[PDB]
Design a protein around this nucleic acid. Structure first.
Ligand SMILES: [Zn+2]
Lengths: 317, 122, 82, 65, 218, 216
RNA sequence: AGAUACCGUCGUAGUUCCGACCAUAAACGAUGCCGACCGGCGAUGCGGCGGCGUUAUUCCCAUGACCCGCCGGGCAGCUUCC
């Protein structure tokens, strides 16, 4: 019953049924949420601190590149899966394991990648019915890069859901250029070839590790259309904005002012005294005069192709 | 508040650069070696210098900070830069290759390479 | 250049561009003198010989000094055909 | 160190239309007084000893005089 | 005693760059004014073309500073032009003297009619431009002198141009524009291909590529 | 390439460019680079003619050779993908590298202690470090730029059509550049493949140090 | 403080159609017309040319609808030390 930082981030206080609870000292000190340290204050006296052996760690990393997750995992995420390996070699039959499991078995569909495959309020009924937010030996990990490596060994684990795992539904990113799948959903640029040729790939992993992956065979994604356009001169200075080609070229430090970057925490009832019922807009600083915006704001205009019919009075960033 | 100064900062880094080997993590031994080399004015200044040297030694013992250029730490760095693993990632068996990449080397008379894999075109 | 008696009445002979044959001016600083080295045809080591080229700045402004040097070494056999 | 580096001199020179008055300040250098400057250097200046080059031994040779 | 900060100045100082001409041949920039003092030396004269007062519109009024248009020239070989704006009028002059030595073009001299003796006039009819100031040099017969405004006559005299026909157009009253444009036009005499210059250019070893053995030394 | 089979692209080396994916080009292609391409395919990945890429490496592998003092070469990465290549390039070269931030005015401002006067410049990127390109436009410096499909050839002198968006894509270019210029100068010759492994010139990515110290 | 003005309620001529007048506009790209030459890059409108594919219930060719490329003339962009 190996404990993970995501189990305390969702606060899965389940030290009651699984009683062989071992964990890493590092993955609880790296958590920056204070309610997890509040969880660390009282309950975890039933678990035990333990590290895995360097013989065990390297054998985890062998089929980790063979399941294509070794750059997708963190460094502390490596040792937790090797911490399960000593527990499985100790308690459970090693004779029921496998490694180098299985091929891709591409299930090409005519389903668009951005379709709401099992997003909860989305329906094609399925309501919310306000009980189901909490209804949305082993381990308790909510990271799929952690969950992928487990079930390919054939290691049934559980979650905050007390039942065991059988279905693993998530999304990965395959490079359309160099055919390299990463389990990370956050990055938008590739890890092997470095282009923006990552595309959304849905997976479905069973407990045995039946990797079958819906590669979306649909030419709206397989498209060269909005992909060629001339770029301005490379500009160097304090306020230059080069159009975000690589994942790490040195942008100049452009930041929002902290009186503009913060929104309203309008939930909090310590709220009445003073100013207007909204956040004050920043009209004073030179963060506002240089028109510095959020990197998340305006992302729909990035998806618009450059050579199009923009209205004759717009200018973006 | 209590912010250090260029006279504190820029002069302490020179002691790191030239005489790192005699330095240590003490305030009170960095300070006693500071007067051996730095021809200083008054003692408040050399105390702030020695404190920034001690803080900077603490910062170094994690990893190299930007301000330093050490004759001893960079040879240590090059002998930690030379991480030479067993198998480099350019000696591999199977590398999946698009069919439009395949036709190039058949025309550029390298179609005899067998490490490739033409995949199902998506 | 040469007077009636034939003395060379000039200070220096300004070099010409090796691409577009224009005079490289004396205060021209995007100008290039690229001393490209020669190989052995057998060993692949250094000959002792080297072919000096020259690119004027307005060519270098246009992004076209790449192909220019590229076809100049085509012209000297330093670039193989295709 | 304004009180032992600069030298203030103030005068009253006369002309037909009135008085001009001049001011001359001479900030003295270092290198103690051979008529030139003070003993004590600048209290901002931090002179560090030049990097003294030392011989590195490899083999334990005991040079016994 | 002068201690250079460039690879150029060392080879100038240490008898490795023979003349001024090899710097012009490979079009190397000169960043040290003492190199000009090395070759020209005595054979170099300077002129103030104007001192004008200018004013910075400060938040508390104005404050007075001075521009200094200094044209220098090797009589028979070379010209230059420097424009320094300082607060002190003696400072602005000696700034622009250095600044003109950093701006030494050579000039090409030709013949009007037949080529007897030494050249005296412009080789062809070159032009120059600086900000609505057209300035046109024109070749002229031997002994006609410079037929110009007083301002380009300075640069043409200090070049060694004995005689020329000048024509100008624009707001020539603005001195800096009108003095750079005639400095522009005399700069272009060596930047003009004439049929004498069709001999293919044997690229000699640049002193960087030649005397780099002495540059590893110091 | 000088049409030598001694200098021809050998059969092992084609694998590495395929391995890292330098043949995979960018999404944009410069028309000045459109000479060097092999073909457009579907989804805008302009596959680069690698034999043409190989021919441009060798001209750069002749350009650096003629300089007597190997210290007279500046080698620059402005970003954090070609840091470790450029540093240990000059360790195997004798070049004079610049890693990380290029100080604006390194080549112009003759007062600086950082002021160096090289005779030849090699750039990792004509878009990331474009600042030492315009610096090289003033001091009469020839220029080599590891040009992607989207790479403006402005103020370049010779240019190499590879990919450089990828981490390993960059490091193999510098390793194999250094692999030829040394065998051009007179170290161990064409027979032995070189003792330095190209994983040394890959970018470190120090999240992988904690992924390599915890296993090896 | 001042209002015959910034306001509102009605409201003629007019705004509408037909037949004649009338010929001015910040009638603007504040940029004559025809022709040649001079950097790129995609998007779009019309016509044509070529083509693996998917749907019109497939299929038989049609023909549309999309998709990739090319040519020509357009309204427009964007780019760039021409
Ligand atoms: Zn990729």
């Amino acid at each position: 019953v190996v404990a993970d930082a995501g189990a305390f981030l969702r606060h899965a206080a389940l030290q009651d049924i699984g009683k062989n609870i071992y964990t890493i000292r590092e993955v609880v000190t790296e958590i920056r949420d204070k309610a997890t340290r509040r969880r660390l204050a009282v309950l975890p006296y039933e678990l035990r601190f333990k590290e895995p052996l360097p013989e065990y760690v390297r054998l985890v990393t062998e089929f980790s590149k063979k399941t294509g997750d070794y750059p997708s995992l963190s460094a502390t995420d490596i040792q937790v899966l090797a911490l399960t390996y000593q527990l499985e070699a100790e308690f459970v039959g090693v004779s029921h394991l496998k490694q180098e499991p299985q091929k891709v078995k591409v299930s090409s569909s005519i389903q668009h990648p951005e379709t709401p495959l099992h997003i909860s309020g989305f329906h094609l009924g399925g309501w919310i019915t306000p009980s189901n937010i909490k209804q949305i030996v082993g381990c308790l990990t909510t990271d799929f890069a952690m969950q992928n490596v487990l079930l390919q060994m054939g290691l049934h684990v559980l979650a905050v859901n007390g039942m065991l795992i059988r279905e693993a539904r998530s999304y990965i990113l395959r490079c359309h250029g160099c055919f390299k799948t990463t389990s990370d959903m956050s990055r938008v640029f590739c890890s092997h070839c470095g282009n923006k040729t990552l595309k959304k790939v849905s997976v479905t992993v069973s407990d045995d590790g039946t990797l079958h992956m819906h590669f979306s065979r649909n030419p709206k994604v397989l498209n060269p259309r909005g992909l060629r356009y001339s770029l301005p001169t490379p500009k160097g200075g304090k306020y230059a904005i080069n159009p975000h080609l690589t994942e790490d070229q040195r942008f100049p430090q452009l930041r929002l002012s902290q009186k503009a970057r913060q929104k309203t925490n309008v939930f909090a009832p310590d709220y009445i005294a003073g100013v207007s019922p909204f956040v004050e807009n920043d009209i004073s600083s030179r963060s506002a005069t240089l028109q510095v915006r959020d990197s998340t704001l305006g992302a729909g205009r990035r998806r618009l192709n450059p050579n199009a019919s923009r209205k004759k009075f717009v200018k973006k960033r | 508040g209590r912010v250090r100064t260029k006279t504190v900062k820029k002069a302490a880094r020179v002691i790191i650069e030239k005489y790192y080997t005699r330095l240590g993590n003490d305030f009170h031994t960095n300070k006693r070696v500071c007067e051996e080399i730095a021809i200083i004015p008054s003692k408040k200044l050399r105390n702030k210098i020695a404190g920034y040297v001690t803080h900077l030694m603490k910062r170094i013992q994690r990893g190299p900070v930007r301000g330093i250029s050490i004759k001893l730490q960079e040879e240590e760095r090059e002998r930690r830069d030379n991480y030479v693993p067993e198998v480099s990632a350019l000696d591999q068996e199977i590398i999946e290759v698009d069919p439009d990449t395949k036709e190039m080397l058949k025309l550029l008379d390298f179609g005899s390479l067998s490490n490739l894999q033409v995949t199902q075109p998506t | 250049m040469q007077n009636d008696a034939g003395e060379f009445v000039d200070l220096y002979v300004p070099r010409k561009c090796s691409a577009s044959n224009r005079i490289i001016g004396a205060k021209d600083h995007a100008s290039i003198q690229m001393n490209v080295a020669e190989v052995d045809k057998v060993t692949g080591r250094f000959n002792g010989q080297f072919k000096t080229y020259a690119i004027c700045g307005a060519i270098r402004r246009m992004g076209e000094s790449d192909d220019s040097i590229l076809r100049l070494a085509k012209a000297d056999g330093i670039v193989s055909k295709n | 160190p304004v009180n032992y580096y600069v030298d203030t001199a103030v005068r009253h020179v006369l002309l037909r239309q009135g008085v001009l008055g001049i001011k001359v300040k001479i900030m003295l250098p270092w290198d103690p007084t051979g008529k030139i400057g003070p003993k004590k250097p600048l209290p901002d200046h931090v002179s560090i000893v030049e990097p003294k080059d030392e011989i590195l031994p490899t083999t334990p040779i005991s040079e016994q005089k | 005693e002068w201690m250079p900060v460039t690879k150029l100045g060392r080879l100038v100082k240490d008898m490795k760059i023979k003349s001024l001409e090899e710097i012009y041949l490979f079009s190397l920039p000169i960043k040290e004014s003492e190199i000009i003092d090395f070759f020209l030396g005595a054979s170099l004269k300077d002129e103030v073309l104007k001192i004008m007062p200018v004013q910075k519109q400060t938040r508390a009024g104005q404050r007075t500073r001075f521009k200094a248009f200094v044209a220098i020239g090797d009589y028979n070989g070379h010209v230059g032009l420097g424009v320094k704006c300082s607060k002190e009028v003696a400072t602005a002059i000696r700034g622009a003297i250095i600044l003109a030595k950093l701006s030494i073009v050579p000039v090409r001299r030709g013949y009007w009619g037949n080529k007897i003796g030494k050249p005296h006039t412009v080789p062809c009819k070159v032009t120059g431009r600086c900000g609505s100031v057209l300035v046109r040099l024109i070749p002229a017969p031997r002994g006609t002198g410079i037929v110009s405004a007083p301002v380009p006559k300075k640069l043409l005299m200090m070049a060694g141009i004995d005689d020329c026909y000048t024509s100008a157009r624009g707001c020539t009253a603005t001195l800096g524009n009108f003095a750079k444009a005639t400095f522009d036009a005399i700069s272009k005499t060596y930047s003009y291909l004439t049929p004498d210059l069709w001999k293919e250019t044997v690229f000699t070893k640049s002193p960087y590529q030649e005397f780099t053995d002495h540059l590893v030394k110091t | 390439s000088g049409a030598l089979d001694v200098l021809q692209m050998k059969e092992e080396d084609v694998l590495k460019f395929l391995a890292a994916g330098t043949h995979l080009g960018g999404t944009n292609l410069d028309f000045q680079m459109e000479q060097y391409i092999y073909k457009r395919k579907s989804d805008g990945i302009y596959i680069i003619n690698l034999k043409r890429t190989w021919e441009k490496l060798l001209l750069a592998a002749r350009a650096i050779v003629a300089i007597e003092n190997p210290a007279d070469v500046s080698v620059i990465s402005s970003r954090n993908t070609g840091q470790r290549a450029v540093l240990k390039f000059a360790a195997a070269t004798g070049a004079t590298p610049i890693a990380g931030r290029f100080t604006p005015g390194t080549f112009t401002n003759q007062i600086q202690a950082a002021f160096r006067e090289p005779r030849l410049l090699v750039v990792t990127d004509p878009r990331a470090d474009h600042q030492p390109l315009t610096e090289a436009s003033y001091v009469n410096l020839p220029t080599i730029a590891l040009c992607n499909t989207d790479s403006p050839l402005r103020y370049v002198d010779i240019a190499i059509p590879c990919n450089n968006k990828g981490a390993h894509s960059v490091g193999l270019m510098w390793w194999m550049l250094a692999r030829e210029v040394l065998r051009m100068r007179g170290t161990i010759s064409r027979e032995h493949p070189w003792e330095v492994m190209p994983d040394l010139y890959f970018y470190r990515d120090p999240e992988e140090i904690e992924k390599e110290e915890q296993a090896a």
